[PDB]
Amino acid sequence: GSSGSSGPKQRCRAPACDHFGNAKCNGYCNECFQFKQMYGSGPSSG
């Protein structure tokens, strides 16, 4: 945020992600979208 820089609002909806996102991925980028998933969603569980 240097002296208020210009730029389109077509970037990942994350504070630590300067990559191009996409509506499908809820705005976020594939990377973020995937990660978001609950780590450990295997088919089996006890």
Which residues sit at the interface with Zn ion, rule CB under 5 A? 12, 14, 17, 29, 32
Residue bearing tokens 């996102």: 21
C-beta closer to Zn ion: residue 3 or 10:
10
Residue type, 38: M
Show binding-site residues for Zn(2+): 12, 17, 29, 32
> Contact, 27 vs 21, CB < 8 A?
yes
Could you tell me which residues are annotated as the binding site? Answer: 12, 17, 29, 32
CB of 10 or CB of 32, closer to Zn ion: 32
Chain breaks in the chain (C to N over 2.5 A) after: none
